[PDB]
Amino acid sequence: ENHGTEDELPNYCFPLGGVINTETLTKVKPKTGQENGWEKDATEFSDKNE
Amino acid sequence: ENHGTEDELPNYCFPLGGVINTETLTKVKPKTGQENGWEKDATEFSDKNE
Amino acid sequence: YMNKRVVAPGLVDCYINLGARWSLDYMDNVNPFNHHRNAGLRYRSMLLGN
């Protein structure tokens, strides 16, 4: 009785670590006196976040 | 009743777009009577085709 | 209309009334026989042919 399959919803496989295609980023903070300035923020957070 | 599992066929999970590992390639026309020669195409076919 | 109307899965997702032998109040008054699992309906529809 080939009634077909109930597969409306997609089903997905996922990386074991939640995500793997990350990339290195450096925290920055707005500059004082410049409406659109920024500086490196290495003082508090490690500059190699992913 | 360890009756066993019916798993004859392989079961596969695929990338969301279906294709991932592509390589950029460019279109090429045959040379006009130059012994199976070839020449790059510029007929509004993208030089970067995946 | 009934086939192109999209219903958000969040209404009846897996985390609904866990452990509760319940019926969704919306479906209390909705006809349950008009369902594609209706065994007699399946039997007749297949009996006349696919």
Side-chain angles (χ1 to χ4, degrees):
Chain A
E1 291 188 356
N2 195 343
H3 284 271
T5 64
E6 309 162 347
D7 53 322
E8 298 83 336
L9 300 183
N11 312 75
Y12 297 150
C13 305
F14 296 100
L16 248 184
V19 68
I20 46 183
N21 309 33
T22 74
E23 50 189 24
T24 319
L25 293 175
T26 304
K27 174 162 185 171
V28 293
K29 66 263 189 177
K31 185 162 185 175
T32 299
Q34 308 286 352
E35 302 179 12
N36 300 88
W38 279 272
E39 289 98 327
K40 186 182 182 184
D41 199 4
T43 69
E44 179 66 20
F45 291 88
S46 58
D47 50 70
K48 297 184 177 182
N49 280 321
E50 304 198 355
Chain B
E1 287 187 357
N2 188 5
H3 195 257
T5 65
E6 315 178 15
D7 54 274
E8 329 285 2
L9 302 184
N11 308 265
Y12 293 136
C13 50
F14 301 88
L16 292 178
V19 176
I20 163 176
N21 304 335
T22 86
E23 184 195 5
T24 288
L25 304 162
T26 306
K27 205 182 183 185
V28 165
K29 311 183 306 175
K31 280 282 188 176
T32 303
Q34 219 70 9
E35 309 175 23
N36 309 23
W38 301 92
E39 184 177 4
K40 185 178 181 177
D41 181 300
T43 328
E44 284 280 52
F45 270 75
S46 317
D47 66 331
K48 300 183 178 181
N49 302 341
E50 283 61 23
Chain C
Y1 182 84
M2 299 181 175
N3 195 90
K4 296 199 180 183
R5 208 69 196 279
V6 45
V7 43
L11 305 184
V12 207
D13 204 331
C14 67
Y15 44 80
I16 175 61
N17 303 338
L18 303 203
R21 180 150 175 269
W22 194 241
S23 174
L24 301 180
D25 313 0
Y26 309 96
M27 305 299 302
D28 293 354
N29 297 13
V30 172
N31 189 332
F33 296 88
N34 305 331
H35 197 285
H36 69 261
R37 282 182 177 270
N38 198 338
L41 211 256
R42 293 185 127 196
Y43 180 88
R44 269 124 65 186
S45 175
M46 290 181 142
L47 177 53
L48 283 187
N50 78 324

